[PDB]
Design a protein around this ligand. Sequence first.
Ligand code: HEA
Ligand code: HEA
Ligand SMILES: CCCCC/C=C\C/C=C/C/C=C\C/C=C\CCCC(=O)O[C@H](COC(=O)CCCCCCCCCCCCCCCCC)COP(=O)(O)OCCN
Ligand SMILES: CCCCCC/C=C\CCCCCCCCCC(=O)O[C@H](COC(=O)CCCCCCCCCCCCCCC)COP(=O)(O)OC[C@@H](O)CO
Ligand SMILES: CCCCCCCCCCO[C@@H]1O[C@H](CO)[C@@H](O[C@H]2O[C@H](CO)[C@@H](O)[C@H](O)[C@H]2O)[C@H](O)[C@H]1O
Ligand SMILES: CCCCCCCCCCO[C@@H]1O[C@H](CO)[C@@H](O[C@H]2O[C@H](CO)[C@@H](O)[C@H](O)[C@H]2O)[C@H](O)[C@H]1O
Ligand code: CUA
Ligand SMILES: [O-][O-]
Ligand SMILES: [Cu+2]
Ligand code: NA
Ligand SMILES: [Xe]
Ligand SMILES: [Xe]
Ligand SMILES: [Xe]
Ligand SMILES: [Zn+2]
Lengths: 44, 40, 75, 91, 513, 72, 258, 227, 56
Amino acid sequence: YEEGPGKNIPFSVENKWRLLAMMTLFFGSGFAAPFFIVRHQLLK
Amino acid sequence: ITAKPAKTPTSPKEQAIGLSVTFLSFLLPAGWVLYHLDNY
Amino acid sequence: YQTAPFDSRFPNQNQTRNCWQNYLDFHRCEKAMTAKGGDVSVCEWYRRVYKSLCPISWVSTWDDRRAEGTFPGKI
Amino acid sequence: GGGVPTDEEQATGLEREVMLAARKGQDPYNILAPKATSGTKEDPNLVPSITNKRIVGCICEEDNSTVIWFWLHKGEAQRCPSCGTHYKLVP
Amino acid sequence: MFINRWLFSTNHKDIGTLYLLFGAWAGMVGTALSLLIRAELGQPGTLLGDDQIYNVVVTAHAFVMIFFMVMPIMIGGFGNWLVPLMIGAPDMAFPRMNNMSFWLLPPSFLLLLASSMVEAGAGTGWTVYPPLAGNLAHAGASVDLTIFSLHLAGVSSILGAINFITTIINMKPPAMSQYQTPLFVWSVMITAVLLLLSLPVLAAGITMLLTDRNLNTTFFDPAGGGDPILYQHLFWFFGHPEVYILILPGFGMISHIVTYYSGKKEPFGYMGMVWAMMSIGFLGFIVWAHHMFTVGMDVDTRAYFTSATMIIAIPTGVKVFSWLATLHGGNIKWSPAMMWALGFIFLFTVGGLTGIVLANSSLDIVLHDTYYVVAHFHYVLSMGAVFAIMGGFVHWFPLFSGYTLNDTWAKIHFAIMFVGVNMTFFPQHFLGLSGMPRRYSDYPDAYTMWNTISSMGSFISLTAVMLMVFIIWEAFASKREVLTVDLTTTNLEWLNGCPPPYHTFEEPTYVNL
Amino acid sequence: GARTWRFLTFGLALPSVALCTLNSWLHSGHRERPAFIPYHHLRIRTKPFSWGDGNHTFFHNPRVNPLPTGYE
Amino acid sequence: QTHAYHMVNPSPWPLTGALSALLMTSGLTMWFHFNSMTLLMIGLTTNMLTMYQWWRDVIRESTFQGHHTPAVQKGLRYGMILFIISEVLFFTGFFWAFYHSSLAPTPELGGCWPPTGIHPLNPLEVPLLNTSVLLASGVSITWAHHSLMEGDRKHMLQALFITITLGVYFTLLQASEYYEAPFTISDGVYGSTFFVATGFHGLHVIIGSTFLIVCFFRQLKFHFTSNHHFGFEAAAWYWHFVDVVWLFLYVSIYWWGS
Amino acid sequence: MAYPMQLGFQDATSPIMEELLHFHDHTLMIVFLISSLVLYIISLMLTTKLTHTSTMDAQEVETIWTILPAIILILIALPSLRILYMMDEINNPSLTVKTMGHQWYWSYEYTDYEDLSFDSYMIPTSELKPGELRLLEVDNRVVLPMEMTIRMLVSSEDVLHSWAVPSLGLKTDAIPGRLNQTTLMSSRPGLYYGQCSEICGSNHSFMPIVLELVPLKYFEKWSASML
Amino acid sequence: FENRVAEKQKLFQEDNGLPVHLKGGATDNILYRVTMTLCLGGTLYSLYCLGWASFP
Ligand code: HEA
Ligand code: HEA
Ligand SMILES: CCCCC/C=C\C/C=C/C/C=C\C/C=C\CCCC(=O)O[C@H](COC(=O)CCCCCCCCCCCCCCCCC)COP(=O)(O)OCCN
Ligand SMILES: CCCCCC/C=C\CCCCCCCCCC(=O)O[C@H](COC(=O)CCCCCCCCCCCCCCC)COP(=O)(O)OC[C@@H](O)CO
Ligand SMILES: CCCCCCCCCCO[C@@H]1O[C@H](CO)[C@@H](O[C@H]2O[C@H](CO)[C@@H](O)[C@H](O)[C@H]2O)[C@H](O)[C@H]1O
Ligand SMILES: CCCCCCCCCCO[C@@H]1O[C@H](CO)[C@@H](O[C@H]2O[C@H](CO)[C@@H](O)[C@H](O)[C@H]2O)[C@H](O)[C@H]1O
Ligand code: CUA
Ligand SMILES: [O-][O-]
Ligand SMILES: [Cu+2]
Ligand code: NA
Ligand SMILES: [Xe]
Ligand SMILES: [Xe]
Ligand SMILES: [Xe]
Ligand SMILES: [Zn+2]
């Protein structure tokens, strides 16, 4: 296996802009989920 | 701690883009839901 | 008679058994007095106490079960 | 009434290596705590290694709760930075 | 290779990394839930709906913050990364069972999110009391999905506890006694013993709730001779130990951070710190009914639970004073991690003291099921457990990643979060003393000012959470590689470099007697 | 030793099981079932069972287990 | 490596186990609420496949590859002791529920224990026989252990076969007593406590019997040495745990609770 | 009831609530002092360039840090437990009233003499009379005699509720199948408000309690008129 | 039965780079594939069941 900084993680840090997108989707999806569940409960 | 200088420095402009994108990723989806509560 | 006095058998916050015991005591006394055609007036103290302490719905449920033959206490 | 194998007959792999080394009073897999020498420059603690450096933890005085950790390198004896106890790598 | 490494791991560091990513994601869920609470309460009236949607949000907030954020980060994340390194062990005792502790959590979380999506959700409180949580007042699948979520989280933590206790007892260097292991390692061993003993009692109680809901048992149903109060005893017999489980690994990280940034080789009064954590763990099993002072128990029982609960202040005070005595004489480095730790010492002390107020059953009559309790537990959780997590994250991020954070950004982050959590929770003391109940979607008009200020505080905390994500991005974006770390002689976890190799201690440490 | 624990197995433990087997054997056979009384604390039905018609317990014995409405 | 510990090959069984737990729980939900057993039957199948392959691999690692040094064996000893402790506390919850209900019988019961309309089993009939059976099996497993330490293959196999036969006898007697019982799980808190507590105990008897049968086949295949046989020790400790829980159930529920 | 910008407890209406105020004042002084001392000592540890980083002996100082807290806890526990046992003391009530919690309203039963019972529901916000309090008023108040020892028995006919009146120092859980007792004695006439204090579903926020404390003779006539 | 443990020790110590869960041969791969297919397929089915149960 690859060893060293940026290699001991399940996500790539090779490109900071691809990383920003991946982090945006990751943290953003967790923060968004409760709002969309509330929307779901209100729409029944 | 000591550390090397950045291998891929993040300029003030690059930091403004990352901070802006980060904040929008939290604020736009929640803002869309809360704006539309009456509709729901 | 104003209300049910303090009873050293039931000194704590949970008064469930106080209501239950007085309802049983009234109905046992009433059965004992009616069997001989004795006088149910001697049972009056237990009647006043259970009426003071017991929720209306508990009394109503217990009375229904005595009529149905499903009351689980011994009378 | 027999028919159960012994460790001598059937132990294999690392289990067998440990078993055979212990018969010879040897500890290649570091099961035992090594006993200190006087730790002087003349009589250093001898630290076996399969490479050219190994981490030492020094309990400088009996019942210290603090362990002092450092890399010991092949070459001249090094000293514990807290108590000055001498350690020498034996690769 | 990727599947073998990240789905089939037997490596304590990669499993720790999985737990930290899981806990970080859970923290965003729990933050969104916290903002929905404060949005509902931030002006008088109704925003979302009645108490059912409101208490689904409150219930999910608590389960996510406790079971998916704090426990996975402190025990799964810091514990897996640090415990083997701090004892020179080559991995955990049960490296494959360790991976199952991790992989039970995504399914547990999926069952919780399903609970909120089906029917009207589980609006029960995180305590899940019957009969509100029973099959009449919460008909349908929501509460059963919540119970199964708890079952999987509980199996995860029980097997993890077996792993940590075995690792810590059996895999130290042969010369190292239990009294030569670092305080963080003690904090994890004691937390693991609490998990091992408490979670099975929760398992029994929620299983009884499941059979009352689905198999016509009546453990908690008076119609069958059951008792709702029995559920409360079984829940809280777990629930009091659980709050010690939430703070003990924090106490361990605080000891390491205060020692490190004071320039000390060791914490003040090591054996007193061990004694204090074992005393808190023991006393934590004999106090549960301080959650039940209004249920109608006997006066002598109330007297006992008041007295036993107050005893916890003695060992806890020894820890607070020993942290202060560790700072004493230090070469203080005002790192971001040190700021988190100093905030912890003060704000944990405030929340512990409002806990001693609540321990008084007579006063608890008026404070129970009010915002005074909410203020107490958010001082110890949202400013104690969370400040220990943030201090440990900024202290050990360079070890885990091999990269540095921007210390100026991390100090800004601390300052915003410090203002936000205090603005959120300080005014809740006033709301509790003046009688605002828990689990309300709306309040009498008199309570408006403090609810307004509290909600404004919650938005400042949101800004801090958003900035933290940016700060992690900026570290990985810039790639400042670690060179030298000070005090490696008394911090073994740093001695294999940053990050350490996949396999460490293939050759064990040499420690003589 | 093994010899002693075999002595205890065959000399004490299995004889005990044989005697208790005899005891149970001699006390087997059906007792007369009691009058059905629709007590509200028994035959609980807050939700139908997930098998059969929803009203039969999992190891329902028609001879000794009445339904809420009485014996079958 | 120059330590004695086991670096385990990367494994899929933790993930298959975790997903089997999702399928079993979502399956129970689908059975209780959506009238369907399909997810549950997939989850039970993947759970059994996971257990089979995981413990197969532990046997490969130990008997066939030699990774179970004394240090590894000592870890497994602690793990099994800790697991048993967690199981004790799980049963403690059910005993608490039992004592809570029976020491303070509510008016709905008639304010007595046993409740009005409950006819308990005679503790001197099949329950006493079950007690003799599990105690006898504690003696036979001890014979099996000493036979194995003394290197006696035939007597180990005979004693372990007797132990398993008694575990099966207990299970068949309990199944019959469930069918014959005039009270059910729906007979208030008496039925609730009786069936859930004895039912979890019965599940543990089946688990422990299965573990003994695994030991019986491993013994037939010569896996155990006279000094190295942790799977047998662990099965024996588990089996004593099952015995002891039974004695507490017998005294508490069947005798004192009658 | 609470008033805007309130910091502390509602003014005491009962002697036991008076006792709780004085006990809280004593406990809060201790909370303030210990919080303050910890903050001050943090600031003292952090404001000197002088250093001492060698090993420090712990045992002498640990005596002070265990004994002084033990003494403080005893000084809290003594008055705490005096009040606990005072509330539990035998008082001889003049009147017994029952309250039953329901989703989402309270019923009251006054059955010492006659069969008096009624339901007590929140006044909807749209039906409040001018000057009335949002979420706090009820249609039918719990009329009680002032300056008299009253036994309140609390239960539920569905889920958990909790019957609370902060200004009287009262909070008793409402548990189905259980009859919990507390005692109520008002030093004053007036209107005393509380709110359901156990999560009970959709309208937990909207099932308040209003006590109306009046002279015995008014209570007797009201009782007669409510049959 | 005869003691064939030595033959299994040789098989499971063969220097073929296989992880222990596949080192028995082609039957291990089949049972692995069945197990992972039921797990992943079952998980997709559990998600479908949530979708269905999330609406009236
Ligand atoms: C990390 C989590 C955590 C921790 C560590 C604690 C710690 C304490 N808790 Fe808390 N608590 C909660 C989380 C926590 N709590 C939660 C979540 C609830 C609500 C549950 C629910 O209903 O949902 C709760 C509820 C709760 C109640 C129930 C209140 C009610 O519902 O009416 C009580 C009652 O006694 C209590 C007390 C205490 C006490 C005495 C401590 C002690 O351990 C504190 C000890 C610390 C100190 C005292 C400070 C430091 C000491 C000194 C500086 C020495 C000198 C001090 C003195 C002399 C006093 N807490
Ligand atoms: C750990 C536990 C925890 C934490 C941290 C919090 C945090 C917060 N809580 Fe809560 N809360 C509870 C546990 C917690 N809570 C519990 C147990 C209840 C009772 C439930 C019930 O009544 O049944 C509760 C109830 C509760 C109520 C009462 C609801 C009611 O009675 O009606 C309110 C009201 O304002 C509230 C608000 C908040 C807010 C605004 C935050 C904010 O401070 C949160 C801000 C965000 C953070 C603190 C960041 C979190 C993320 C991380 C730390 C991730 C880190 C990432 C890396 C390390 C990479 N919560
Ligand atoms: C020889 C006895 C062996 C027992 C085997 C029997 C059935 C399979 C399940 C066994 C597991 C044990 C306990 C689960 C709960 C209840 C079953 C109790 C034992 C039993 O079998 O009880 C029966 C009822 O079963 C019923 O409802 C059947 C209900 C079937 C579904 C069970 C639901 C599972 C519950 C979830 C378990 C959660 C696990 C928690 C793990 C903790 C993780 C932290 C009794 O029959 P009856 O007709 O009512 O009375 C007899 C009248 N002649
Ligand atoms: C119908 C019922 C279905 C329900 C599912 C559960 C059913 C059955 C599970 C039965 C348990 C079987 C366990 C088999 C373990 C086989 C592997 C084994 O025993 O492995 C041994 C190690 O022990 C070890 O891992 C010890 C491993 C111990 C595991 C024991 C776990 C008990 C599991 C209970 C799980 C569910 C309980 C939950 C109930 C609420 C191997 O070392 P040795 O023996 O020294 O051999 C080496 C020598 O040959 C060298 O000379
Ligand atoms: C607790 C976390 C949330 C905190 C508050 C978040 C702050 C809000 C961020 C912006 O959110 C957006 O706001 C827009 C309005 O400003 C919305 O557009 C809406 O309103 C516009 C103006 O009327 C229209 O043009 C758009 O079509 C319409 O979608 C848009 O959907 C929404 O994403
Ligand atoms: C490896 C991949 C994993 C495999 C995934 C397999 C998915 C296939 C599931 C089959 O779907 C079934 O559909 C049935 C009907 O269409 C349902 O019957 C149930 O629902 C019916 C309602 O029509 C009723 O007859 C009964 O409740 C009952 O038969 C049953 O619940 C459901 O499972
Ligand atoms: Cu009734 Cu809350
Ligand atoms: O829980 O305090
Ligand atoms: Cu507690
Ligand atoms: Na609102
Ligand atoms: Xe959970
Ligand atoms: Xe659990
Ligand atoms: Xe205090
Ligand atoms: Zn030294």
